[PDB]
Each structure stands twice: as C-alpha cells, then as structure tokens.
Amino acid sequence: AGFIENGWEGLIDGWYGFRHQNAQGEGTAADYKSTQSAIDQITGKLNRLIEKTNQQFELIDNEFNEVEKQIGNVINWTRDSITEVWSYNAELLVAMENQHTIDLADSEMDKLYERVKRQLRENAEEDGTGCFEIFHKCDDDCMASIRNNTYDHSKYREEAMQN
Amino acid sequence: AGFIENGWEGLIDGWYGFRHQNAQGEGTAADYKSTQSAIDQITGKLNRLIEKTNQQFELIDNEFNEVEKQIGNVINWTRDSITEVWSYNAELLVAMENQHTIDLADSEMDKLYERVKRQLRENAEEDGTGCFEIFHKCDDDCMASIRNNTYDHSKYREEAMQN
Amino acid sequence: AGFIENGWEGLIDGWYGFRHQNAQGEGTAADYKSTQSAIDQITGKLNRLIEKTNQQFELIDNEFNEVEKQIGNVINWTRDSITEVWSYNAELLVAMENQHTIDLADSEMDKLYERVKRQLRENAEEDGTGCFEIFHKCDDDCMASIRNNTYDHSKYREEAMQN
Amino acid sequence: ICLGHHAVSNGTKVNTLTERGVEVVNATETVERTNIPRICSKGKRTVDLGQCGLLGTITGPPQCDQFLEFSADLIIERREGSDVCYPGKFVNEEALRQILRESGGIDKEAMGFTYSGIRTNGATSACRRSGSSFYAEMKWLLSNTDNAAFPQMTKSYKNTRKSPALIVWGIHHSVSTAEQTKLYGSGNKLVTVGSSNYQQSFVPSPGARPQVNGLSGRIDFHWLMLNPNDTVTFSFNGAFIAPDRASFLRGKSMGIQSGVQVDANCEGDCYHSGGTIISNLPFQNIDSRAVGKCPRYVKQRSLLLATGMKNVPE
Amino acid sequence: ICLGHHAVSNGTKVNTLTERGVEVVNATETVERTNIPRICSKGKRTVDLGQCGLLGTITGPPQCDQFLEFSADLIIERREGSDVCYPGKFVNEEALRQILRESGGIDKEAMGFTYSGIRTNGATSACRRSGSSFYAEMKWLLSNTDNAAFPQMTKSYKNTRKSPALIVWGIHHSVSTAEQTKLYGSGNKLVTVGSSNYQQSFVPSPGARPQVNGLSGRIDFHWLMLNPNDTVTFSFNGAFIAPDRASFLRGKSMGIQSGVQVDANCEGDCYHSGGTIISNLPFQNIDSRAVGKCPRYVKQRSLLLATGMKNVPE
Amino acid sequence: ICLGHHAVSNGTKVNTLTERGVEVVNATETVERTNIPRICSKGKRTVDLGQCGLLGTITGPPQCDQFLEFSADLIIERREGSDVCYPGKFVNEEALRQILRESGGIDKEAMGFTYSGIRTNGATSACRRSGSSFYAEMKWLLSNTDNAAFPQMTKSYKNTRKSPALIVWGIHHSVSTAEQTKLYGSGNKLVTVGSSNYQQSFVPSPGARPQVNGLSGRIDFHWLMLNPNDTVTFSFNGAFIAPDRASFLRGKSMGIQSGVQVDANCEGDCYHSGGTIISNLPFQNIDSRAVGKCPRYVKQRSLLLATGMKNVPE
C-alpha cells in the first residue's frame, strides 16, 4: 500500500504471485515458497493461542443458595478484578498479534521483491511501483527461470546494458 | 541515526521534510502526507489507551472501622496481588508501545526515502548519508515536482546518464 | 537466512564480521561497532527482566493446621487465578521478546549491509547473496578502509566504471 | 514484470496497536459465544441429584434414599433438590457442599452406637416412607416414656480408616419448652463435642418458628471431620439427633449446579448452569462463573484475530 | 537533495523494551497523580451522613433522625458518624454496611406489632430528644411494673412486598443480673428467630462493661433479610428490643467514606477518601482502594509514553 | 567482499510469537528451579520456635518459657511446636497467628489483677516445671476450698500505652458438671467482656472429651486488642482463666513455617517451607505459597529467553 499501490483480487492462486507481460503473452502464477512461509507463520500464531488449560477451577459461589454477603462480596470483587485483567490481556494480545501479522505479511513481500531485484544484476532497473523494467524482451522460458530462481545474471547482461 | 546521522531542529514545519540545494537557492519544506500518516498512527495508540472502564468496583474494606483481621488479610493479599499484576501490565505496555512508536517513526522515513529514490530512475545515485546526488542541475520547478511526486523519470534521463 | 543463506561458525571473533578475498589473500574480522550495538540491546532486555520486586507477601494459609475450608477454598481459588495470570504473562513475554530479539538481530545485519553498499557508489554491484562485487581488484589497505568507513567513493570510481 | 500479493472484494475489519477498523484478507474469532444447552457427560460417571440436595446425601432424607452411597466423576445439583425433610439447616453448609462436590462420592460406615436408658425411634410425617419415618443415617433419641429424664450420656467413635471421616449430628429445637421436656425432660440441655482438631458444645433453643411442612420445630445439623486414628466423643443429655453412620470420601470429582438435561453424546470439561462450553478458543463471553476447564471469561463479545494479510483493492 | 526528520534541543526520556532513558520528540504521562481534594457530586443525588452512621439509618438514633428514609445515588459516610446512642454494636456489621451502600437508600414500613401484657416505652438519656428518648425505629419492651414477669411471647411479620425486607432486632445486656430482673424478671431469657433462610436464637448476658456515655449496658443489634412472601417470627421472653419498622432497599447507589467537602461543580466516578480522581489516563498512583470507575492502581509514580519519534540533534 | 554473522554447531531451541523450537546462538533461563534447602538468615534477627508454638508465646506453656518476650525480624514456626500444655485451642487462632508473625515479637506488661475471695493457684501435670505448674502468663482462678462459691467479680485493665494491647483470657470446660462445681460451685457460670471495639460474653460447657495428655477437660482461649486509652473489663463468676500479663507488639517481622535448618551464611528474602529461593529471575516453579520477596510463581518448568541471534549453519 504505497508503491504496490494495490493488490490483485484475481490472484486466487496463492498469497504472493508474479504477473509478467512480454511480447509472448500473459501470465499470473503464485510463488508457493513465499506463500507457504507466511502461511506457516500464521499457523504458528494459531497453535499458540488455540490453547487448552489443564487447570480446573471449582465453584466458590452458590447460585441456588447465596453465600454470606461479606464473603460473597469479596468473592465477587475478586472475580471482577480477575475479569478486568483477562479482558485487558485479551484485547492487547489481539491488537499486538494483528499488528505483527500485518507487519510480517508485508515484510514477506518487500523481501521477495529485493531478491528478484538481486537476481537481475544491472540487466534491469526499478520502476518505482514495485515493478521491474527489462531492457531485453524476456521470453517465457526466461520467465519461469526468473521464477524458479535460476535466471542468468550475466548471460543476458551485455545485450541489456546497451539498452 | 546512522546515515541520516542527525536531524533538523530547524524543521519546525512538520515531522518529515525536504532540504534541497541547487544553483537556484535554498529550501526546507515538510512532507505533510508522510507527517500525517505517522501522526495519524500515534493518534491511534492514544485512543486505545486513554481508555475508560465501565466497571464499578465497590468497597470491601473499611477505613473507619477495620474489618476482621483474617478477612482483612485475605483482602489485602488479593489487592496487593492485583496491584503487582497491573504495575507489570502498565510497565510492559509502555515499554512495548514505545519501541513500536520509535520503530514505526523510522520506518516511515526509510519508506519515504526509498520512494523518492524510485522516482529518480538512473538519473541519480545514493550518496551514503540519506542524500541524493543529481547529475543534472535541478531547478525549483523540478523541485516541488520531486516533492509532489510528478517528476519525470525519463524526461531528464539521457542528459544525466552522460554525467 | 535467505540471501546470506547461512552463517559463519568460524567467526568466533564477534557477532558480525567481514570476509574478503582479493588477490592479496584472505581475511575475517568482526565489526565490533555493529556487534556491540546488538550486544548493548540484548543487555537492555536482560536488565528489564532480571528484576526484583520490593513487595513483601505474607502467609494467608497454614500448612501445619489447615484454615477453615470455606476461606481455604477462596484463598486457593484466588491463588490459582493469580497463577494462571502470571503463567500467561510469563509465556507471552518470553515469546514476544524472543521475536523481537531475533527480528532486531537480523535488522542489525540488513542495516550494516546497506551502509557498505552506500559507501561503494557505482564502483560495485550487489551479487544477490549478500555479497559485493568489485570491478577493480581491491588491496588490503583498501580493505580496512572499507571496514573503518573511510574508503573513497569517487577516487577508485572511473577505473571501475569502465569494468 | 510485476510482483505483488492477493486481495478480495469483501474483507474483515480488525484492530491493531495502531488502527481501529483495518481490513484483512481473513480473520478468525477468538472469543467463544456458542454455548451448548446440555450437560455434556460422555465418558464420565455422572450423578444428577434431582430432588435430593447434596447435604441430603449425608443425613438421608427420603429424596436421597437412592444416593446415600453414591459414586461420581460429575455431581449435578438441581434447584428442586432439598437437604431436608424435617425443617432445618446445616451449620457451615457451603463448605460442606464444596467438600462433597469434589469427593468423588461417599462410602458409609456404621459407627455402632448402642443405647441403654432412652428411646431411639423418633419419627415424623415430613419424612414419609411406608409411613412416618426419619433421616436414614440419623437417629432421633428420646426419653423412654412420653415425658421423663434423659441420662447424661457419652458415646465415642474411633475412626479406624486411613481417610478423614465426616461426622454429622443434630440439635433439635422444639416449638416450646413445653415440647422440649415432653421429649427429653426439663432443665438446660447440653451437647458437647471434641476431637484433636475440635472443641465445641451446644444447647437447644425452643420457641416458635414459621411452619415449614406444617412443623415449627427446627433441626440444627452440624459436622466435623475425624482424622485417621483420632477419636470423637459426644457428651449429651437430650435434644439430640445422633449419627448412626459416618461418611468417607471416595476420591475425586467436580460439582456443578445446572438446569439443563444430561447428554452422554457430547464431551465437555467446561460447565456452567445453562450448559457446556465446547471451544478451543482462549476466551469466552458466556458465563463468568463457569467451572471446570475453560477459556478465560472476558467482557468483550468479540475479538477478531487476523489470519490473513492487509487488504487493499484495485 | 536531502530528506530527513525533525528534532529538538530538549527532548524527553522514556523507556523501551530495549533501552532505559532514550530521548523522544514528545511524550505524555500515563499515570495519574493529580487528585482533586473534593467529592465531585455534580448531577448526582448525594447524601452526606455527617454525624449519622450508616447502620444508624436503620435503627434511628437522634443523629439519624433526618435520614430514616433517605434516597441516594451517592452515599457518604463520615468519621464522626455513629450508628448508636445507647452503647452497642451490630452483629455482621460490615456486610450490612456493604448492603446499605449500594441500596440507593431505604424506604420504611410499619410491621404493626401490638402489645398485651408488657410495657413498651423504654428510654434513656444517651438518646436525647426533647427529653430522654430511644431508637426511633425500635421499641424497648419491658415488664409492666418496676419488676415482675415477662410473658413468653410470639410475633410474626409477613413481608408482603416484591423486595427483600431488612429486619432488625436487639438483645439487651444489662449491667447485672440484678438489673436484668428489675427490667424483665428472673430466669434464663431466650429470643428465637426463624425464616426460610434463617434459623437462630439468643440469650442475654449481663455483667459489667466499660462506661460509654456513662452507661455500662450494651445493646446487641442483629438482622436478617425476609424474602418476598416468606415470613418471620420472634419467640421471646424478655431482654428484647423489638423492631417497629422494617426496611426496603430503594434501588442502586455507591458508597464511599471520606473527609473532604462535597462539590456539585465537578463530575466524578472515581472516588477515594481524600477526593475525586478525574483523569482519562489508564493508570493511577493515588490510592489503591479508590472505588467507583477508576484507572488501575499501579506502584509506579510515572510511566511516560512516547508521542513523538526518536530524537537526535546536530 | 562478503558480510555476515556468526553461528554455531549446537544452538538452543526457544519459542516465539511465530515459531516453536527455533534455534538461537545463546539463551538463558527465566524460571527458577534451583532451591537451597535451608532458611537463609544471614544478617537477620531470627527466632526458631522449635517446640514452642506461636500462640504459646502469649499464654506461656513450658515449651514457650524461653519465648515469652521474644524479638524478631524472622519468626520460624515448626511442625513440632505446640501452643498448649493443657488441652485446648484458640478462638480466631489463625488471625492471631498472622498478627504475631509480623509483630517483630512481643513485650509483656503486668496488668496487676489482685484477688479477694477466691483461690489463685490452679495447676496440672500436663504443664510440668519443677513440679505441676500452669500457663506462665495466665492464672487459674478457683473457689477457696475444694467446693464452694465463686463471687461474681469484676476486673478492669486500662491500656496506658501508645500501642494496641493483646489481651488473652481462658474459659475452662471441666469433664463434668460434677467437676465444674467442685472447682467453682454450681449454677450457670458467665464471663462477659467489653471494650469500645468489643462486646461479647461466655459460658462454660462441661462434658466428656477425648483424653489428650490423659486429660479430658479443655481450656478455651480467647483474645481481643485494647486500643490506647481504651479500657477492658471482665465480668465473671467462675470457670475462668485470668490474664496476668498483657502483650504489646514490638515492631515488624515476617513469619514462615519450615522444616529445614537455619543458615547464617546465606542471604534470602524469599522463603518457603523447604528452603530459601535465591534468584534474580522474574519467575519460579518451586512453591506457589512462598512468602517474602519472590519471583512470581508460574506453572511452567522452563521458559528460555533468547540472548543471541538466530542460528543457521553451513
């Protein structure tokens, strides 16, 4: 939300994908290994919070026959106190995790970008909206090789330098 | 605090500003849209913490006539326990938010930098102290256009490439 | 763990180091000023948590002669409640700090990288695995000057541009 | 070539340290609101007491005739339950209740008290059985003949078991000092009671009380716990309802109070009076007083946790 | 061209997960220390009891003559208040107090007890009015003539209202068994009391006590709560202070204890004995026992929250 | 040129918001498990009571003869301690205990009660000294001659000190009404007690109890706290064990219960019954009921905190 000024509702394939456009034609394909890493991490959070206590609590109150008021009042006072605390814990935990979920998603993008950028030596230059400019028409063999991190960083170089 | 090795006490205009120096003269102007985004976010924190409970607590103690010691002691023990907890919650919350306030401020810089950098194709090269080097004397029409994100990334190119 | 696809068990010198390889020979030396900054920060966390309360708690129970059951039960109920809370606080605190310890370590790398990169104007180009390519054989005077941030960014330029 | 991330038409709003309402690709609920309106008991030895009240299972009113020696993992009290046929109440009743709830049930044992010089067979119409009866575990001790004296007596019971014994006696309070003497003869009456833990003693207190099952007398029930090998003695001279049988706790259980039906088709460890809470969620907004093994009660109706990334469209 | 961020000569030091003393552009306090030394009552129906003690409003000593039927959102107890003219105390006094504090005040009702065979008009000089008087809601029952017998009596009161009724009686303890008989005749005296909830009974206990307002007798005050339709009865034979009027709770209120003046010019929901805490802040270091709607008490005097970015100068 | 970071063959696994088992360069324990099995008392004025029980230090059984005026920073109760020689117990015993634990010890003061018309020197063989003796701070009041009357008496003690005084008396309960009269003559016996705070009164209750040191009588011990200048009076007529000396609290202390040896070679502020916890750590898994100045108890055995960075090898 800044230079990738929006996102692709069409990308039903995964979380993170490629969208190329050379002469050859079109393409949109998810990057599963970046998708998974993020997915694996939301998974991590969910296993730390879908969580089961092994702490039994019993009854100290009585709903059918009220206990003495004084002890009743201390008991209610304690319960209320401990409710305030857990409502606090719950809301903060949710807010804190959601910031970090968000912040970790974007950080998975910015880190995919800069790895593709680093594959493409000087054979290319950053557009300014999270897109890459090739100065040599790249075919669709050359594509899935940009994708499956193989593309040669000096074996297309010279040609593109010129342009 | 590293490559922007300090900050501008003179910048009373906003949080984030520009400071240019071509032949034409001088200039210092805040970038309100980056200032605001940060400001909008400190605002967010302040509305989540300037917070009002709707939980009444009543008295379980008595300052004029002390309650029985045993119940008095349990009551004090509970209160103290619940004080320890909230003093803990308070200090951690403050520390955690302040890290994130800080870390979010800087992150608003580093992200403004790299967007200007991305406007300036190859017509410029990174100095190493958060400053940008133009290899073509840029006038002050050209300035507010670097500023109001319009500046043309190929319509000054050729000239500067050479230099 | 991505482009610096691993780390150097050989680096017993510090946390962050340099490893060069020109004609002249070999070298591995820690960057103490980046090592320290991280170290100084793990230190910070440890002084906020190796922490001593000045809150005395006394006994409200009795192990030799059990108190009345009803008060005994409320007392146990409270204690258990307050245990659940602190076990929660402890586990979250540890998890939250460890993410941030980790995330702050890496962030100290990524920030050292990009400062060296910024010393080396256009006299060099990013490899794609956190290594830097010089297009002019750099001797070992030139090394400790890359290291002690002095290296001249235009006084080796022209030569390397060509190559 | 361009690289990016997915998105959607309709996302879900969550909250963050920083923003209130931010959309996300996906989100999941963190606070349980879904209750099942049944006591889920699958796999658990359950005792629903119905008309028998819990303290009743010790003294034995007709309600509790089928519960005098019960065995549970899960004890359920009902609103309709009563501890009592002949109008009275228990001293320290709730503590006793809290004990019985986690006892795993009770095993009875004859204390073997024998009687010379008094009647033994006191009954009433509040406690119906075939005819007029009494508290099955208790004995209503009288004076031999329609008036006359009550011998100052002593009885002791030695707990010979490895477990703490639950001892219960009763003090009768007759409608009058007229009725008091017709039962046990005149003069101040005194019951005394001691163990190693324990030291106390009791007097009756006749006078009128509201009619409850048409009777105006009250029985005061009391109780203590004999440790192993420790011994208990009863100094008394009338106005007394002796324990016939003592009680031993079986093991371990949990006790709830509820008004919904049992269901051996679902499993549950978190209970409250209108049902079982089954949830994996860390939190709940259903009932602050739920007992068992439960998510934490919180005030909030809902707290959405992001499970997807930020959401920005075209 | 260069881009950067603002800064200042003098910043403020805060703490972080990582550093202790780091400067920032701006920061704001998070813990309230500012107290206002007045009970802020603006918009609230307030009752400052002054010399009347809270329990006094039920029995009616002269202090509390103007409070026998009060109505509040906010009840204030004072140090100088007394529940009592004739030296005595309440059994279960604090629980009673906690009840009255949130009652929203009290509405009285004649229980209509009538008397045959006893005197009715007991008074004393501790309870001054025009002359020597007594507890306005109570009645000091005697024997007809300077000695002589007290008829074993019964009285019942049926609560006909939809609310729980607050019943209060008293047991007199005279300076001697000499004084006890001169009042109610000789022999052990017994008061008994029952409802559905309730079962108890009482004896007087004469003997010397320190002089308090020059009197050495004590009155023991007791109390129970009749539910709707449930009924209460009093078996007694002397040494007794009958309830004339019963009490019903009005609605809802909050009770504080304080020593500062009222102020209908400020609004407050967090109170403590030296004032009102008005603050938006999440926390406070003023008084751990503040009641109402309050920031959380914390030990720390101060916790600064950053509202500006890091601060580094030239 | 390449730049990077260190690593190791064998790292340590920790947990994060995000991952469960991630390795790190270094890590440190956050939960204390190491206990020292001794009461660390270095620099502290310690009193180990051994065979004397805490309440004993007020009444004075032979166990507590060397503790009647003790002075502490640290009071230690032992399992073998007893408050008692002549079989009895304290009413409100634990509250009293909690008081004594933080008292810093006790200073005694003669209340100066003198006696006309009764015996004064009651003793027993449970309380051995040179011969048969009694509770050193108490006085066993009788009737002059092997039967006969007990004069209805009064005694008052004015607390003249700036501190609250601890007053203790006892009610004797004899094995019979036979034994009761042989001691104090016949008829109902009544002790009454009043202050400004206080209002109560007591009767004996004879009858058989189990033999404890071969005796079947019990002594009931009671207690109240006279404020400064306030005064206390004792109305009594027999069955009474008078206070000879009153008690004043010294200052401030902490009380533990333990079964390990003292050690003036180590320093500690967190104690539990099997030792001292010495740790800088924020948490502990040793004993939830530790008292003093302690890390927080937590359920977890261990929680590793990262002190080094991520760890990835060749």
Ligand SMILES: *[C@@H]1O[C@H](CO)[C@@H](O)[C@H](O)[C@H]1NC(C)=O
């Ligand atoms: C305690 O709270 C419950 C509801 O949570 C309420 O029904 C009860 O009246 C309270 N106890 C007292 C002392 O009134």
Ligand SMILES: *[C@@H]1O[C@H](CO)[C@@H](O)[C@H](O)[C@H]1NC(C)=O
């Ligand atoms: C409870 O703490 C208060 C002060 O917070 C103190 O005045 C009071 O004495 C304590 N209660 C007991 C049992 O002493």
Ligand SMILES: *[C@@H]1O[C@H](CO)[C@@H](O)[C@H](O)[C@H]1NC(C)=O
């Ligand atoms: C309180 O818990 C302790 C152990 O933590 C246990 O020994 C004791 O029995 C419990 N109290 C009651 C009321 O049983």
Ligand SMILES: *[C@@H]1O[C@H](CO)[C@@H](O)[C@H](O)[C@H]1NC(C)=O
């Ligand atoms: C959306 O969240 C739900 C939470 O129950 C989860 O089950 C589901 O897998 C998520 N969907 C996607 C697309 O991840």
Ligand SMILES: *[C@@H]1O[C@H](CO)[C@@H](O)[C@H](O)[C@H]1NC(C)=O
């Ligand atoms: C209990 O008493 C029996 C028989 O008197 C004896 O054999 C046993 O050792 C005693 N057990 C304990 C632990 O007191």
Ligand SMILES: *[C@@H]1O[C@H](CO)[C@@H](O)[C@H](O)[C@H]1NC(C)=O
């Ligand atoms: C400084 O912080 C205070 C906190 O009260 C705030 O009111 C003010 O707007 C802040 N000033 C600036 C320059 O943001």
Ligand SMILES: *[C@@H]1O[C@H](CO)[C@@H](O)[C@H](O)[C@H]1NC(C)=O
């Ligand atoms: C209360 O008693 C009145 C009259 O006896 C009766 O009409 C009413 O139904 C009763 N209410 C309840 C709920 O018992």
Ligand SMILES: *[C@@H]1O[C@H](CO)[C@@H](O)[C@H](O)[C@H]1NC(C)=O
């Ligand atoms: C490893 O952690 C321990 C924690 O006690 C610390 O003392 C030590 O200095 C650490 N070692 C290194 C290499 O930092």
Ligand SMILES: *[C@@H]1O[C@H](CO)[C@@H](O)[C@H](O)[C@H]1NC(C)=O
């Ligand atoms: C206590 O009494 C003494 C003597 O009667 C008197 O001098 C002193 O003022 C009194 N102190 C208080 C505070 O009552």
